[PDB]
Subunit: 292 residues, 5 copies
């Protein structure tokens, strides 16, 4: 059976004439094809006001090294070893659309090497990835957020993102957003290789938002009532004034949750503006009637 | 008695042909069984809006090294030494459900080594661990939060979490949540080893929340009074209007503390929506009566 | 074709008598001219209250090394290599107007070296750059923010910023600000070299702000109405009082979004102050009339 | 006089056969007694809602090394040197009740060594130390916060905290809290050595809080007036309603400053709840009278 | 002309028998006099509630090394070189009144060395420096903030701050505070050397705050009017009640901007408390009149 001394001999032979910074190909004319695997773990939140979405992923990079291959029959059948991440060449795959708030660095950890040269490198990344949030159809709204991977500095003649496989790990259920992330896309080769996984997000229809809607609809009933009140009821001015105050309060409060960076404003904005305008016109008519 | 020179000789012999990155077993076919000890120290807070809980723990990892054993009779009876954490192989146990906001790194500190090979490695971890918070039964609510440990990259054929012992250190009393963390669970071996400790949290019934409830219940009395007021009292419209304004203010204010990510909304939400709806219907009836 | 051994020989010869800290010129009387390229990627936000703007850029530095040149015909036609950033002299170009909140350090990464000595060094920088925000013409306001680059410690006799080319990468569209960053400016040589790229920002006229304006203009109609109400209408005091309350609420709420550090306050401030003063004078006149 | 060469010889001889990780005693049966000095510099704030207190301290550790002693007459009377902190054994004294938000690490700096072996090690620590805040007697409230020091991993048979001397440096005056930190406590030896300094904090009676109280007491006068108003005054219902609204606003606003984690709620909570209940009963009586 | 090889020889000779941690004097009885230069660049903000002020400075330290001097005629007239900051002895000047939130460390960068031994070391420091803010005369208020420099661990017999020259770089204009920082102060030698630069700050009288004042003064007019209203006007109670509500709202809102840690509260606090008390007494008198 393989032993500690056997693995020591193997590592000593492997790292003898190895340069960490030279691209690992016998012929430098060859490109290194990297295939990436992005497995969303938990969508923490979807921040509207900052136009960010916070999630945690499991990024796996796979490629092939031609200087790190051996015959297992010469080392008592050792078929894989674990090397420190900072001793070996590693593709410079950067998340160039996200703010990487992970608690580990990209040069600490380990990677698994196989006797054929294939390297597996897995990591945890917590990302704050920028999204252009369209709040038009609030609260029945849908969004599309793209997470980008891109080679840092190497041209497509040196390092390439062969493929990107994105899936959902289903580790936890959300109860707030319907997530749909699943597919397999080839990399795009225009000067520097890159790719992106699209995340589609539909807000789930919990009854809490329906309960929040209830006051609005009854306010619709109340405003129509006061605007179709008799001209000489004897409480039109005060009633319309208080209704206008409450409407202004609602119009102010909705803004603090809704985003200001959208292709279109929300129909709810435009509808509450119409309702406030109707309340104001009702108050003006009441004042005119009292004058007359 | 053992001396400084004796310990120098011991360390020099121990670290002679030692490789930090090779798994510490004479026969590489053997697995290293790690037993973990998680001792909650102080539950700082339970953040509802972010669905996180902040606490401080004392994580202890214990395993056995077969290359670091000696006969104490040959070194004047030295039975244990202290080694820097970054000179020895260390299991890659990651907290893969938590945001590790500790102020130390996982490669600075020390570990105790015994002449039989057993290594003790203890550390402080401040964790922001994700929890799915069910606010259904607020303020008589209970929650269950699971803290996960999982081997980083090694398969169950290489590194395993043998066992997880979780307890409560009772270092401080909370006065806000009844904490119940105590047990002993075997590790789960499905590809990569992992385990989790369940924390059950029940909000304590301090009289401060009762005092907060008082205004609500008396408001129930006041709304029933106004809704069962005589049709021609002469203050129904104004009274009901002001009650509705206060009701809307309460319904808005409760939202800012309660969470939006729940299996069900809180009964308090649904009940205050019913109360506000009754107030609105009372105002409509008052308007109809004034019309008639 | 060039091979791994050829590149090993090349690097070994290049780095033989190289000093990382000596300025890379054969004759020390010569200056090193650095040309910088700043390519704005995405304008995240424009923070009014903190007088900052958050954006992400792509900073590229180009210069020439005279100790790192070779004849490609002697190494099987190798024409470029990749070196670790911390092995070679690198100009100390600091962003001396910004808070660099990037997640990487200025000594980790790679740089491309060409057989003629020309070095390309590209990086991602997330900057919080200070801007003096003039909110005079809100919400039809325009701003100018200058991003500075400056050599750290070397005098213009040693290191110089030859030129600065700034452009907009058009990676995403904003929908909130009209960005206009494009040009080419020589460096300024007054003791220590520096340069700056001007960003002009005009807030876009989305209909959401128009919807926000609607309540204000109708409030203008309502205040003029109440101030030109008949002296003995019988609701002047109460109506004017409520209008004044709403006016004070709006005047308070506008402050929390607008900045306090401006050459002039916003015309909207001065106009809402005039409107509130008119409402107060109307209330005083109503009180005087009721007295009479 | 002593010279640079003399100090070079001294350091070279001292560090020859020195091991950074071996506990610095000739006989390993001996314990190393550490005496700590904690000198509070400025109490920044006392955060009620997070149950933390932020302050800056000056932590000094003193112990004795038996491998770092020399005869000063053999080095031209050199009596003390300065060594880098990371070349020498240093006790692992951790602040195990606090979140260490300092801007330096525990392995960068310097320490003073004396020819007798005595080592002085001084540092700046900014600490966010957890406190259980009893807001019962607000705003005449007193608090007790304990700052803990504890050996990290060594047992009382290896490393001990001999003594802890805590004082107040009086560097600045607070004007918000009366601080009383002064004493001298032996270390506690139960498995692992530790100790704690008690900080007693009494909120100072500035007239600003009295000014804040004034509206409350006059509101007491107003509520008693309305509750002892004649049954048929003709404004009882409206007056009581407005008083109830303002009281509810105060009861809501007080919560946002007061803490939710206390042994008892504040008497101010319970008293304002009594006042709100009395206002509600007054309004109910008014409604009953209007019915009759 | 001097060449790369000449500078290589120079550095090799300079660093031959150099110890980074030995104080750089031939005779150890001599003190090293450090002169510091602090050049404020931009005052970002003056945080009232946290009692901090955020600014960016340019700290320059100058001292003399006696082991790093050469004759330029022996190296082809080389007169200055650039060394890495972490290879040479550096005075441990700490900002011991501030929270150093800079993005660089105190051991990365470069320093210029001259053939006479004089070393220049310049750096960027972003500081959050504690200030005791006296808000007595708000908004015509003045403040004094002292920024401290102090040697870390060396006594005045080893390292001294000879002098401190503080100036204002006038890089940007503020428009919010009148800054006056300029002078030259000797260091204070009481055990450990230190010094401080006083910053005087007077809030500028922009017309925005005048506009903010306008509502207050007109409210003074309105409260005097209602308090000197006829006893039987027929709107005294309701008018005084609404005025009192608005007064309470303003008294609450002013607190959130003003500080709680002051020698005296602001005259604006005391004056608005007087105004609120007068409004309350007016309401009480109105109630008494209605009773009579
Ligand atoms: C489906 C899946 N999920 C996760 C997760 O962290 O959720 C992690 C892995 C994974 N497949 C792997 C294959 C090799 C290494 C790690 C993983
Ligand atoms: C019950 C307990 N509690 C704590 C705590 O920090 O609260 C720490 C330890 C502990 N047992 C240990 C055994 C070995 C090393 C450290 C600890
Ligand atoms: C137009 C442009 N944009 C970006 C971007 O990140 O948006 C990056 C680059 C770029 N040109 C380059 C030339 C060499 C290396 C990198 C880049
Ligand atoms: C009373 C006192 N105060 C402070 C402070 O930073 O406030 C610092 C020290 C000190 N005594 C010392 C003795 C040796 C080294 C440093 C200090
Ligand atoms: C007046 C002034 N201002 C600044 C600033 O960054 O504002 C920087 C410097 C300076 N003088 C120097 C002399 C040597 C090195 C740097 C500086
Ligand atoms: C490298 O190229 C040579 C000739 O071009 C070829 O014979 C050899 O097989 C190549 N090596 C690899 C690993 O492709
Ligand atoms: C080598 O190991 C593989 C996998 O464990 C096994 O299938 C094979 O039979 C082994 N061969 C020898 C010669 O031991
Ligand atoms: C996810 O989105 C894709 C494309 O928008 C669609 O084809 C697929 O059906 C979606 N998933 C589900 C479960 O509907
Ligand atoms: C991706 O590249 C492979 C390589 O030939 C090609 O067969 C395939 O059609 C491409 N597209 C997709 C979607 O896989
Ligand atoms: C390793 O394996 C050999 C044979 O398989 C056995 O004799 C030996 O005892 C094993 N060593 C250990 C430490 O289990
Ligand atoms: C070795 O040490 C242990 C524990 O201190 C003790 O029980 C034993 O008697 C010692 N043996 C010798 C030979 O000193
Ligand atoms: C803690 O929870 C477990 C399982 O939910 C239960 O068996 C145990 O009784 C609980 N602890 C206490 C003190 O009740
Ligand atoms: C855990 O594993 C041990 C190992 O045999 C087994 O005896 C035990 O039943 C398992 N379960 C628990 C709860 O300990
Ligand atoms: C350096 O200077 C010498 C004489 O001044 C000149 O001959 C030589 O070409 C110069 N080298 C470079 C690289 O400019
Ligand atoms: C060297 O490489 C360049 C670019 O690949 C090519 O144009 C040239 O013909 C090559 N020369 C030789 C001798 O291989
Ligand atoms: C950008 O600004 C410059 C100078 O202010 C101006 O010349 C140019 O026309 C602007 N860009 C566009 C697209 O108008
Ligand atoms: C910049 O410097 C070059 C160098 O000669 C000069 O030709 C040019 O006029 C300068 N100005 C601009 C705007 O390029
Ligand atoms: C160490 O122990 C021996 C005998 O036990 C004793 O003679 C010697 O003085 C001790 N050394 C110290 C430094 O205490
Ligand atoms: C050694 O130094 C001390 C303190 O400076 C002094 O008191 C003593 O006289 C000196 N002795 C000699 C021999 O220089
Ligand atoms: C500080 O507290 C201790 C114990 O609580 C007390 O003895 C001492 O008198 C207090 N300090 C002052 C100045 O009163
Ligand atoms: C602390 O320990 C010393 C050591 O003997 C002892 O004399 C003293 O009584 C103890 N208690 C205090 C408060 O110092
Ligand atoms: C050091 O001291 C000696 C005698 O005390 C003196 O001759 C020499 O000049 C001094 N060196 C320096 C650099 O002051
Ligand atoms: C040395 O350089 C200085 C400054 O460049 C110059 O004034 C002096 O003439 C030069 N001397 C020689 C001998 O080159
Ligand atoms: C700055 O303050 C000092 C002392 O307070 C004063 O002498 C000086 O005149 C002030 N500066 C100006 C420009 O008035
Ligand atoms: C500072 O020290 C020098 C040194 O002699 C002295 O001349 C001067 O008077 C001192 N005071 C000031 C303000 O410079």
């Amino acid at each position: 059976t393989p032993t500690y001394g056997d693995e020591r001999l193997l590592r000593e032979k492997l790292l003898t004439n190895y340069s960490k910074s030279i691209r690992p190909v016998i012929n430098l004319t060859k490109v290194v094809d990297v295939t990436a695997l992005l497995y969303l773990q938990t969508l923490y939140d979807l921040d509207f006001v900052n136009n960010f979405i916070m999630a945690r992923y499991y990024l796996g990079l796979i490629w092939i090294d031609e200087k790190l291959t051996w015959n297992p029959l010469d080392y008592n059948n050792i078929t894989s070893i674990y090397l420190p991440k900072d001793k070996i060449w590693t593709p410079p795959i950067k998340m160039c659309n996200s703010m990487d708030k992970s608690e580990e660095n990209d040069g600490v950890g380990e990677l698994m090497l196989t006797y054929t040269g294939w390297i597996n490198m897995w990591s945890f990344r917590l990302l704050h990835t920028y999204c252009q949030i369209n709040a038009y159809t609030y609260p029945f709204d849908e969004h599309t957020c793209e997470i980008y991977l891109c080679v840092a500095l190497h041209t497509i003649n040196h390092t390439r993102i062969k493929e990107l496989i994105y899936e959902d790990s289903k580790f936890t259920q959300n109860y707030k957003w319907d997530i749909n992330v699943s597919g397999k896309v080839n990399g795009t080769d225009e000067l520097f290789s890159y790719a992106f996984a699209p995340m589609y997000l539909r807000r789930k229809l919990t009854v809490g938002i329906i309960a929040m809607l209830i006051p609005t609809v009854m306010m619709t009933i109340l405003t129509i009532f006061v605007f179709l009140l008799p001209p000489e009821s004897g409480e039109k001015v005060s009633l319309a004034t208080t209704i206008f105050l409450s409407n202004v309060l609602y119009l102010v409060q909705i803004d603090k949750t809704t985003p200001t960076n959208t292709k279109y404003p929300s129909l709810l904005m435009l509808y509450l503006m119409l309702l406030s305008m109707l309340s104001g016109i009702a108050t003006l008519g009441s004042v005119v009637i009292s004058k007359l």
